[PDB]
């Protein structure tokens, strides 16, 4: 039968900004996870609940594949129980997360001399995201009691900021592509390992 289209997530030419992270719903297909765990070298391949090696033996209703770019120092926030600007305001995993987090350095793709300004993250948000919440608002952030009325100014900040990746940045400041695989258990199971 039909193979799960993981290349169509991992090998995508373009990746999303973290604030507007993409989600691919994977369904009715067969997936080998041992190939991913050997298909490339990833700087991070951490699984929670499941086992990277002992993973092709299980069945699930749907698999979600979330992907985005963040800074190298921030990959540690893509884990249950973490905090920080990314975990709090951009992409939040639940405390009970079962799934895998895969990351690799994308300096050669996502950095540019003079700064790549296409990748953004949310800097200002009044409250933390719920798990798997996606906030794509560009409303001006009101940091005082005076309404902003769509105009930037004092206490009135555009909520997104650019990473500005340059290839000469320290590794902790280089762009990393991230894929989060989430395993749904609800209904006939439709994705299984061989």
């Amino acid at each position: 039968t039909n193979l799960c289209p993981f290349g169509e997530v991992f090998n995508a030419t373009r990746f999303a900004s973290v604030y507007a992270w993409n989600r691919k719903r994977i369904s009715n297909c067969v997936a080998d996870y041992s190939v991913l765990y050997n298909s490339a070298s990833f700087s991070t391949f951490k699984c929670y609940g499941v086992s990277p090696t002992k993973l092709n033996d299980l069945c699930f209703t749907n698999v979600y594949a979330d992907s985005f770019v963040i800074r190298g120092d921030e990959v540690r926030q893509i884990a249950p129980g973490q905090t920080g600007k990314i975990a709090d305001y951009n992409y939040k995993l639940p405390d009970d997360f079962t799934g895998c987090v895969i990351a690799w350095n994308s300096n050669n793709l996502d950095s540019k001399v003079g700064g790549n300004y296409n990748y953004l993250y949310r800097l200002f948000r009044k409250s933390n995201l719920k798990p798997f919440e996606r906030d794509i608002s560009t409303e001006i952030y009101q940091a005082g009691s005076t309404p902003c009325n769509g105009v930037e100014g004092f206490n009135c900040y555009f909520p997104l900021q650019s990473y500005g990746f340059q290839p000469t940045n320290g590794v902790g400041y280089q762009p990393y592509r991230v894929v989060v695989l989430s395993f749904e258990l609800l209904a006939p199971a439709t994705v299984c390992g061989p």
């Epitope: 905090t83 600007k85 305001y89 700064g115 948000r125 009044k126 940091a143 990746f165 940045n169 320290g170």
Partner: antibody, heavy 118, light 108 residues
Framework: EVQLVESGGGLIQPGGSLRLSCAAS????????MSWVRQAPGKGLEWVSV???????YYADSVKGRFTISRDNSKNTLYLQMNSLRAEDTAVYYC????????????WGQGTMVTVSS | IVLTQSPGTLSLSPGERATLSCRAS???????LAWYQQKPGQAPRLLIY???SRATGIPDRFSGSGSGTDFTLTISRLEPEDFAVYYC?????????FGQGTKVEIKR
């Protein structure tokens, strides 16, 4: 009329506790990144703690486990609880509002002196 | 990230140009850097954020530049009120850190 008015500094014995407070006007403390920055006599600025609008808090290693940053939205006030104080915590303590790449640390309190000594 | 300012003391006359350096131990986006002025007995005052954005009400003679590891604060024509200590700051980490300060003093 934007300002940060600090209170609570004074003399304290080593191992003692103090709480500093920072009453804000002209912006909403709970909506902002807020920081405590201290300066020992004759020395530079040491950023010791920060609190995020959503509640996350972070500390310099020099104060971890001893200092707690917090706030009260109804009083629009930032606090710093300092326990297990040591002589080297003697400094002027500033509170400040941080905007990072959207505007730097733009609002600063007037500073309050903490002296730790037996 | 350690910020190292140089020189420790800059000795100049009014009307001269001041060039203040901040070197980062780790190469970083320009958006993460800021510059502050502090006079004796006063709180620091923000001058520049994002390496080059002049803060509100700050005189035009103050300008910042740089990227990567090397950042510069320039005062194009020193005025008597500019003799003070200057601090650089990075906020790439939480909390960030400051440089150790550069003093600008009257030369005689």
């Amino acid at each position: 009329e934007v300002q940060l008015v600090e209170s609570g500094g004074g003399l304290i014995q080593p191992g003692g506790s103090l709480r500093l407070s920072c009453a804000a006007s002209g912006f909403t403390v709970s909506s902002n990144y807020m920081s405590w920055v201290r300066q020992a006599p004759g020395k530079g600025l040491e950023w010791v703690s920060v609190i995020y609008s959503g509640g996350s808090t972070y500390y310099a290693d020099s104060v971890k486990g001893r200092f707690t940053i917090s706030r009260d939205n109804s009083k629009n006030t930032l606090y710093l609880q300092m326990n297990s104080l040591r002589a080297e915590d003697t400094a002027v303590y500033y509170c400040a509002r941080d905007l990072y790449s959207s505007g730097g640390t733009d609002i600063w309190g007037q500073g309050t002196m903490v002296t730790v000594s037996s | 990230i350690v910020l190292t300012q140089s020189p420790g003391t800059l000795s100049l006359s009014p009307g001269e140009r001041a060039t203040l350096s901040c070197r980062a131990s780790q190469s970083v986006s320009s958006s993460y850097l800021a510059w502050y002025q502090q006079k004796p007995g006063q709180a620091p005052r923000l001058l520049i954020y994002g390496a080059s954005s002049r803060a509100t009400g700050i005189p035009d003679r103050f300008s910042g530049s740089g990227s990567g590891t090397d950042f510069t604060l320039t005062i194009s024509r020193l005025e008597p009120e500019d003799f003070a200590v200057y601090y650089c700051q990075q906020y790439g980490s939480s909390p960030g850190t400051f440089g150790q300060g550069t003093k600008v003093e009257i030369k005689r």
